[model samples]
Structures are given as structure tokens and as C-alpha cells.
Target: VEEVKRIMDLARQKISDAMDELNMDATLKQSVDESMKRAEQRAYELSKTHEKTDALGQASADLARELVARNTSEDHQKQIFEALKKAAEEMAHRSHEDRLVMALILQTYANAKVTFRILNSGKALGKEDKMADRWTRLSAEAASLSVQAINDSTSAEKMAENFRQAKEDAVASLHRAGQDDLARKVSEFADAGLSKIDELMTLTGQMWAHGLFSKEWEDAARSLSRLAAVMLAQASQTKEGSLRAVKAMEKMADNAADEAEKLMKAGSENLY
Candidate 1:
């Protein structure tokens, strides 16, 4: 949030400086107001409504629905908040000195997943079209593969390689289906690139504090963070990790979606 606001603010600052010297560039005032307005809203959303709970507050009605599905005992219910808070805090403060590359790889996967969710979710808004449906599926397939590849590959680089391949496949399919503009725009819209992932992670890290979700979901999120940390340690070291270690990580990926169901479902909101 700060980064975006900063970038726009700086650009606006430059525009002001330029406008003072030049005799009023055609759209200076319009662009300046637009940028600053966006900056304030982004700031406000990040600061205010992003956590998004329902009427019951921490013990919201939606969470109640999820808890009923879990069939978890009453004894463990309150502890849910503690665990989720812990997870969210860790994410916010997480260090990527070693996790950088693996984080970047996951970033792409996150964008694809979020893009898939956002496009398909349009139906909820009563705006569905068959043409848009194709774009929706293209993004969805890539998102699913992103999760599945967690278990399918043997190394961070290898898994990352899988992500790139899947993303490219999506792009190619989009173009083949006669969506060249959208095909090219996927990188931006899907949040499937460097800065997008960075934003996703930042937003997600604060979710625990937001405290709107359930235990099973929070655990799923924590699981992904832990996996990222493990792979980060390995990926930052060498191309080759031990066979046993690599196998263990691969095994973790096998159930990655099941493990990350909560965060995955959070979609563009939390994950990307």
C-alpha cells in the first residue's frame, strides 16, 4: 500500500515540478487529482476495511458456518484466534533474505490464482458472458496447476520452472482463442508478476490480525508460509537439495491445495 502510494505520489510530484516550468500541460490537473485520489483510497483500504469481518465481529456469522462444517469441538474453538494471529504476524514480519527467489516464484502462481478467481467471480455480479468464460477458464487452469506443481516437482527452481511453463501455456491459449489484448494483459490483471506477488504477500500477512477467517483456513495459510520458508532456505543455497529433502518437499506439494484451501479461496483478496 505504501509503495503504491509512494510511487504515485512521486510521479505527481514530478508532474507538479514540470507544470510549473511548462505552460500548463494539457492534462496535468486531471492526472494529478486522479493519482492523489487513488493514493488516498489505497491508503484507506489498506488501513481500514481490508480485514473485512461480518456483523459478529471476530466471531462473525460466516466463521460460524465454517466452524459447523469443521465439526471441531468447542474446547478448541477459541484457540483459533491465537493460532491465526500468530500466523498473520509471522507473515507480516517474514524475512526473505534467503526466501527471495522462491517467494518470487510463488508470486507468479499467486497472480494466476487470483486472476482466475476474479474473472470467474464475475458471475456473482450478474455480468457473465461465454466469451469471458473462456478467459476465466484459461486463468483457472493456470491457478490449479500452480497449486498442483507444488507436489509435482523436485526442486524450487524446478517447481518455479513448472509455474513459468503453466503461465506461458495460459498466455498462448489466450492468444489462440483470439484474446491478444487480454493475453498480454494477463500479467497485469492476474497479479501474476513481481510486484503483484509482493503486494499479495503483504496483504496476506495482515490477515491474521484482520481475524475474519477460521482455524482450518488459518492453518492452511500457516502451512504455505512454512513451506515457503523451507524452500527459501533450500533455494537460496544451491540448485540441488538432498534427495531426501527434495522428496520431502515434493511430498508436501502433493497435498498443497488441500493444505492451502483457506488462503487459496481467499483468492484475489488475500493471496493475490
Candidate 2:
């Protein structure tokens, strides 16, 4: 009878120890999961920053090219034009880089915007739901546009065509998603503001051609400079807005990632 009692006591002690271990494991797992979530949030934020930086850089480069083309003397215009043409050619060759960068930027913004829409509307998505499916589809489309933009066979006309296609797709998506109301308003503002920038990009390409073929390109160069100043101002405002949105999205993503990490960690620890 004494032996039997001792065996039972040992078994009870073992069960208690197992339970304690399980609880500790659960706690550890929770902590780990939280850490992982934080990591993901940071990653997403970093991605936003990267996209913003690239866009800003591209805009800056475009402006600089235009400014250079404008400031040079008529005598030096030919040289500048040749250089511009060569640069444009190189840009065309490297169009893939621009496309990929733009894809990432547009995708991030699209997802953030769509997610905000759903949240604002108080819509609940199921675990199996793909919330930003439209954004995903758009990203793929944007990527294809980039590919087309970079094709060696593509001319300025082709570039314009490609841009038109992308713009149309974006407009269609906004309409379909009922984002047209907001998008149209934003686009109107963007258009008025970004026209100068757009003009600068266009004129820069023209300046390159003019420098190659005609001394009469002086008038075009002058016009480009005036447009460039406006573009720079508008770009600055647009970039500021974009940065704000990116930061907000990144913060939210970070919090979510942290929570997910904590949950996963806790689950793992419990299993152990």
C-alpha cells in the first residue's frame, strides 16, 4: 500500500511539471510571435520608404536633365541634345528598372488605399478572403506596362500609348471599385499640379531631339525651363502626400505583423 501511494504521488508531480512547462512554453511563444509581427511591420515600412525614395529620385533626375538642357547655350545645344538623346536611349533600354520601381510603388499605394476603404466601410473579411485582390491584379498589369515601356522597339509614340493604356486601366479600376469619386477628385488636383512636371518630361525628350537636328530648338528649351520649375513645385507637394500615406500604412502593417508574430510564438511554445 505504501509503494502504491508513492507511485501515485510521483505521477501527480510529473503531470504538474508538464503543465508548468506547457504554460512557460506558451508564454515564450507569444513573445516570439509578437517579435515576428514587429519585424514584418518594419519590413513593409521599409518597402514604402524604398518606393518613395525611388520615385523621388526619378522625378529629381528628370528635372535635372531638363534644367541642364535649358541652361546650356545655343552653341552647346547640339551637344546637349545629343547627350539627351543618348540618355533617353539608355533610359529606354533600362525602362525595365523604372517599370519595376513604379509597379512596387503603385502596388503599395493601391493596397493601402483599398484596405483603408474596406476598413472605413466597416466591412469584415473572412480568413480566406483576399482583400487587395484588385490591387494585386493591378500590380501585375503595371508590371506588364513597365515591360512595354522598356522595349527597344518602342518609340515616344509607343511610350505615350503605353502610358495611356495604364492610365485607362487605372481609371477603369477606380470606377469599378467605386473609388472614382475620390480618385477623380485627387486626379484633378494631381493633374493641375503635375502638368508642369509632365511637360518637363515631355520637353526634355523633345530638347534631346532638337539639339540633335536643329539650332532652332532654343525656343523649345526656354519653354522647357519654365515648365520644369512648375513641375518641381508640384512634384514636391505630391511626394509629401505620398510619404504621409506610406508612413501611416507602414505603422499599421507593423502593428499587425507584431501581433501575428506573438500569436505564432505562443502557439509554438504551447506545442513544445
Candidate 3:
């Protein structure tokens, strides 16, 4: 019940924040009541789409990675590289909602921080400061927009819709920038985390296909399987959950600290 209150508190805050990001917070927990119901609905809806996806399917992990050649993409040119890291420790101990909630919330907070930085004319990045610092700001902006697009985009045929062109441009920029080291520092800032849920899910299926009786591979896969669940709470540095991650980031900038508190608050609400 205590934890429940914090969720209600956050729902209240979001409702308040969203109301008038033009003009609004709720007048009542009644305005309050609906948020919980909505979350429950989303949680269920989310699980419905992903329930069968095991926390550990390694072979099934071949996600399509796309990009072009390097000549026009490096130091002599311009490029971007946004690497995503993976973790599964949480799948071992946390719930799916806990994981998903953190992603949405932190991204939500990140969107806010990025906007704040971009619009802050007083503290704007100077041309001569350092490419690394500039990249840090730029990457944060790109990553923020990525989260925004995800929240707003539609899904179909088993995939999400395309992100806006500007968003795509930002990602490409990050890639090219990283390709040359110009934006590698920017990437270091965001450290995007990735989910391994589906890959782990396919572990059993792969075993059946390639090594059903071979205990060697089978035993290893199974052994990994044991470490997969709840422990699956895994997260790359950028993942929203550890956000314990970016934790170290907290000490870096005041802006980071403010957003982090919101992220941590959001996490606490969900964890409860």
C-alpha cells in the first residue's frame, strides 16, 4: 500500500506534467484513480504481446543490424555509432513490468532533460569547447528523441513504425560521429541498454533444433538458462533500470542529477 501510494503520486505527477506541458496536474486522486487503471491495462496489454518470449533465447538473437560503408562515414567525413549493451541479471529477480516501466519513465525523464539542455541558450555548447562535449549533448538529444518516437509511434506486422526523419538523422549522425571519434564521447554518455528477453526466450527452441541430445551444448545452454530468469534484470549501462547505471552519471552534472531523481522516483514507484 505504501508503494502503491508512490505510484499514485507519480501518476499524479505525470498527469500534472502532461496536462499543461501546455496548461495541467490533477485536481484529485480521482483524476488520480484512472492512472493506475491505465497502467494495469498497459501492463496486461504488454505482457499479452510478449508473455511467451523467454528471458533467454541466445541463437534466436540475430537482430537485423543495418548500416553502410565507411569512406563517407569517418573522421575525413562524418558518422555515428550508437552501440546498445545487454544485461539479464534482473530477469532473474525483477518483473517484466518493472523493466518496461523503467524504460518508459527514464526515457520520459530523458526527453525532458534533453529538451532543457537544447533550449538553454545561456549554457549552450561553444564551437571550440571540445567535440566530445558537443557529442555528449548531441547524443543525449538523439537518444531523447528516440524515446519520444517510441512512445508516439504505431506498431504493425510485428514491428514498430518508422521514426521521424529528423530522429533517423540524429541516429545516423551519432553513428558517423562515432565512426570518427567525434561523437564517441557522446555515446559514452548515453550508453544505450538493450533487452535480451526475446533472445533468452528462444534458448529452448534452439536446443531442440541443434543439440537435443548432445549434453555438452545442451548442458551449457541449460546451465545458462538457469542463470537467465529473474536474474534477467540485466541491463547495459544505458538501460533505464539500473539506471543504477547512469547512476555514476548523477555526480557529473546538475542537470543529470535532477533528471536522475525523477528516473529514480519513477523506478521506485514501479518497483514497489
Candidate 4:
């Protein structure tokens, strides 16, 4: 809950630091500062009516827009990248919902960062552009996070809708920016997420039919199924990144399987 506030503060501090580092003129800095204050106020008001996650998403988008609107210096670019890295780190410890929020923030930040670079560039983007590659990776990670969000969500349909929209938007934006290959890759990953969730639910249904799980067991089985889906998803990421998360997912699957084994043995003994 409070993490959102800290993230906003972090962005605010970075904005100021960027200005100071660049020795921005007083008038320009004041205007930028007031615009951010307005954005924060709007975010708070939005939170009164909408989910805090949505509010934070909008706030983060506006922050990125403001950063892009006024500045594109090397110092400014580095500051923006560093600030996002910090915000992501802060989000790493939070719940899945908070990670969803982080994903949305990254979505906006990635688009703005990439668009700004394209505008600043003389030629088409290539693999050689280091920070551009990082931003693209973040965009891909945003898609991955949406998949993870669905795994943890109570209502898969709702999360799926949000995921689809985010993926669609990212693909469209990337295409418009002339990054057709990246757009296709993002599209592929997004579809992979949908398929992964479909597989998860299908496995869950088959398990229910085969095990004839009672309510308690049904719930337990669902958690195990979710972990199984996580394991598959994480395993696929090994070549791309995050081997640690894959191992963690694998460990959880082992634990859940062992627990199920004990439950089955004890139930059989009682029945006999």
C-alpha cells in the first residue's frame, strides 16, 4: 500500500535531481515541478474513485510523459532509466497485484523511453543501442508479468482482458515506431501468456475430475496447479533470464507435491 507512495516520491526526487544535475533554469524547473504536483493530485483524486493500481498507473504514465516532454539530455535519460530500475526493485518485494501495477508503469515508461529515443535518433533502432535493448526487454517483461498476474488472480477472465489490452497497446505502439520485429516478439509472448493460462485451467479441470477433490482438496489442488503453470513459465525463461525464479517455482512445486502425497496416504489409511 505504502509502496506506491514511496515510488511516487522516488520519481519526484529523480525529477528534481535531473533538473539540478542539468542546472535547469528556474522558470522551466518550476513549471515542471508544478505540473508534477498537479499530476500527483490528480492521481490521488483518481484513487478515490478507481483502484489504487489504476491510479498509480496513470500517475506513472504522466510522470514519464513529463520527463519526455521537457528533456532528452544524456543525464536526463540516465536518470529516467535509474529511477525506473529503483521503482522496479522496490516493487519486487510486493504482492502480485503490486507487480501488476509495476507492469503497467513499465508499459508506459517503456513506450515513452523508446519513443523518445526514436525521435532523438537519426537512423533506425538497432541491436547496438544498449539502453534501447533494455527498454525493449522491459516491455517484454511487462507482457510476462501480465501472465504471472493471471496465475495469481481470482478472476482469470478479468485479468485476461487487462492483459490483452496491454499487449495490444504495446504491439500497436511498437509497430507505429517502426520496430516491427520487436512488436511481433511482444505479440508472441502475449499469446504465450494466454495459452499458458489456458493450459493451467485445463490441467486444473482434469485434476478435479480424476481426483474427485472435495472443497478443501479442490482449493489445494488449484494452488498446486498454479505452481505447476509457474514452473513451466519460469523454465521457459531460463535462456532469457531469471534462473532464480525458475528454481523457486520448482521448489514450490516439489513442496506442494509432497504435501499432496501425504494427504493422499493419510486419507487412504483412514478409509481402510
Positional deviation of 185 in candidate 2, in angstroms?
11
Tell me model 3's lDDT, rounded to 2 decimals.
Answer: 0.28
Clashing pairs in 4: none
lDDT of 1 at 48: 41
CA lDDT, every model vs. true structure:
0.33, 0.32, 0.28, 0.45
How far in Å is the alpha carbon of 52 misplaced in model 3? 18
CA deviation > 4 Å runs, candidate 2: 1-99, 116-131, 150-154, 161-272
TM-score of each: 0.26, 0.24, 0.26, 0.38
- Cα lDDT tens digits for candidate 2, 1-272: 12222322332233234334434345433432343243233333434444533333232222222222223333332332232232222222222243223223332332233333323222222232222333233323332332223332235565445444444443454455455563364234335544333333333333422322233543333333223322232222233433332232233323332332332233222243
Candidate with maximal lDDT: 4
* Candidate that beats the other on lDDT, 2 or 4, i.e. the better one: 4
Model 2 whole-model lDDT (C-alpha atoms): 0.32
Point out the worst 10-residue segment of candidate 1 by lDDT.
52-61
> To one decimal, what is the Cα RMSD in angstroms of model 3 from the true structure?
20.5
| For model 2, the run of ten residues with the poorest summed lDDT | 61-70
Q: Write the per-residue lDDT of candidate 1 for residues 1-272, one digit (tens) a residue.
A: 24334433433343344444444434534443453354335433543443211111111111212222223333332332222222222222332221221222232223223323323344454433232223223323322332233334446576565545544654565466555764465435233433233332333333221212233333323323333333333333333332222223223322332223333344424343
lDDT for residue 82 in candidate 1, whole number 0-100: 27
